[PDB]
């Protein structure tokens, strides 16, 4: 007699996951893990991030939300508050403490900065709060954000004692299942054996060779390869070192066993929501690039770890009795130095400098208050003393802007409707620009380049970027692919009417109805 729904589901984001991971390395891949979304599930093989920049905290933001950072707030992974007049960091909460450490940079996290509710936030809602709704990663923001603003926990890593915390936002105290966990000291575990690649070096022909100018170093090893037998002593060091090993994604999924059977996620008809995070193909993708072996052994990796994530979940709870989707956050450029060793177009892409020549323009120093995630941002305080006009100072900075090499447009913020720029540029920008925490200037570069000269980012709109593979399996889901147009907005929106919930309160997508069962 009740609404039909899954017992649990669970929203798996494997952040820098390029769409294109799925079939590069397909022929390497098991049958339980990719494959199996792909072979049981449903693909949209055709998804794009409908904002830019393409940067942290947004995407997982967005995939939640079902909505854009001018409406959510979540403008990058920190922006430049004028009002504050400093930079801020999307979950930085003074008000809360840490909980299970003592650094405050690492625990004093929360979801405040977040405007919309979530799909996480619309259960919690549509079952009276009834529902296990759990966050984990490594990093704070890919776990805080998916969780929403009342979930049952979000737990992140500490890199200074090897455990996961959390912050008085959501407990007082760590929960029995958390210590138990970190007693295990999963991580020292994982990492003993250094790493190496899983299989035989010679047969990642997928990748580049080991050793290339565009790759950087991970630990004390002084050379891009294979092997990190260092791994172990460096980790006991730095316990960060783990989220640029694979070794940081399975100790993820490891925590999110945990919080399922700590929490009895999935076991009665009541709904729950577990959001995962897998960190470590960015980190391993910001420092090694997308060709690198290293890249390509950690989804191999991954993907082992997700064939055994499905089959503990099909223990737990049922096969069937549970709904997956799969996605990304973004993608990832290749390398500039690969794509030059190949002949493709690139480049690398100004404070101080533009400052300078403001100052002998305009009789004033520190016009520019920041400039970050493509954007410009005027002092208000210097230009209201200095007397001088925001449209005349960002006039001469974008012609300026204009004759740089990497810069494909330029605009202002305020005029962005109306520039020559072709969609699905232009409705980008104006999905990515929030009045309040975005720049004055929005700069749009050429294909290819890049902002660190090693490893690769994410942050433009081209395909690369923004082109994010999109699987959902289980409950209520129908086998297949597509390759019509959708959104990374469409997400939340499917989740919400599978579960016949209401939609997110910034959502402005809609749901995918070709994997609706
Ligand atoms: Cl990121
Ligand atoms: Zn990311
Ligand atoms: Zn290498
Ligand atoms: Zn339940
Ligand atoms: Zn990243």
Redesign the pocket.
């Known amino acids: 007699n009740a609404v039909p729904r899954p017992k649990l589901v669970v929203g798996l984001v494997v ?1 820098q996951m390029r769409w294109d991971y799925l079939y590069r390395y397909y022929s390497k891949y098991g049958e339980g893990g990719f494959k199996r979304m792909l072979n049981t599930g449903y693909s949209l093989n055709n998804v794009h991030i409908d904002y830019v920049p393409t ?2 905290a947004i995407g997982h933001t967005s995939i939640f939300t079902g909505s854009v950072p001018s409406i959510h707030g979540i403008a990058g ?1 920190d922006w430049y508050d004028k009002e504050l007049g400093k930079s801020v960091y999307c979950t930085s909460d003074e008000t809360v403490q840490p909980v299970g450490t003592t650094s405050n940079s690492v625990g004093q996290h929360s979801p405040r900065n977040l405007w919309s509710t979530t799909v996480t936030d619309q259960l919690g809602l549509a079952t009276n709060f009834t529902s296990k709704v759990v966050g984990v990663s490594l990093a704070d923001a890919a776990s805080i954000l998916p969780a929403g603003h009342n979930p049952t926990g979000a737990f992140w890593f500490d890199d200074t004692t090897g455990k996961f915390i959390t912050s008085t936002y959501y407990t007082k105290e760590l929960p029995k299942w958390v210590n138990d966990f970190n007693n295990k000291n999963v991580p020292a575990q994982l990492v003993a054996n250094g790493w190496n690649t899983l299989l035989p070096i010679n047969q990642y022909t997928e990748s580049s060779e080991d050793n290339v100018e565009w790759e950087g170093l991970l630990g004390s090893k002084k050379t891009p390869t294979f092997p990190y037998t260092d791994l172990a002593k460096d980790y006991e060091a730095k316990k960060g070192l783990i989220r640029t090993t694979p070794f940081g994604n399975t100790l993820t999924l490891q925590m999110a066993d945990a919080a399922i059977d700590g929490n009895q996620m999935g076991v009665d008809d009541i709904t729950d929501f577990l959001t995962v995070n897998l960190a470590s193909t ?1 980190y391993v993708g910001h420092n090694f690039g997308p060709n690198s072996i290293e890249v390509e052994d950690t989804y191999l990796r991954l993907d082992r770890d997700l064939a055994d994530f499905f089959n503990n979940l099909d223990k737990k709870v049922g096969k069937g009795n549970y709904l997956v989707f799969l996605s990304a956050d973004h993608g990832a450029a290749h390398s500039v130095g690969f794509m030059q060793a190949h002949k493709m177009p690139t480049g690398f892409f100004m404070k101080k400098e533009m400052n300078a020549k403001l100052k002998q323009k305009f009789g004033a120093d520190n016009i520019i208050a920041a400039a970050m995630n493509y954007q410009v941002y005027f002092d208000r305080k210097v230009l209201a003393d200095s007397k001088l006009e925001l449209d005349d100072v960002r006039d001469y900075v974008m012609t300026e802007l204009k004759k740089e090499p990497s810069v494909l447009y330029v605009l202002s913020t305020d005029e962005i409707w109306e520039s020559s720029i072709p969609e699905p540029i232009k409705s980008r920008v104006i999905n990515g620009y929030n009045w309040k925490r975005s720049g004055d200037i929005q700069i749009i570069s050429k294909d290819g380049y890049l902002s660190s000269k090693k490893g690769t980012t994410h942050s433009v709109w081209n395909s690369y970027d923004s082109h994010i593979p999109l699987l959902f399996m289980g409950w209520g889901i129908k086998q297949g692919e597509s390759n019509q147009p959708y959104h990374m907005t469409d997400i939340a929106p499917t989740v919400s009417s599978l579960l016949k919930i209401q939609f997110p309160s910034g959502a402005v997508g809609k749901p995918i109805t070709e994997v609706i069962g």
């Open positions: 952040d940067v942290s992974a960015d």
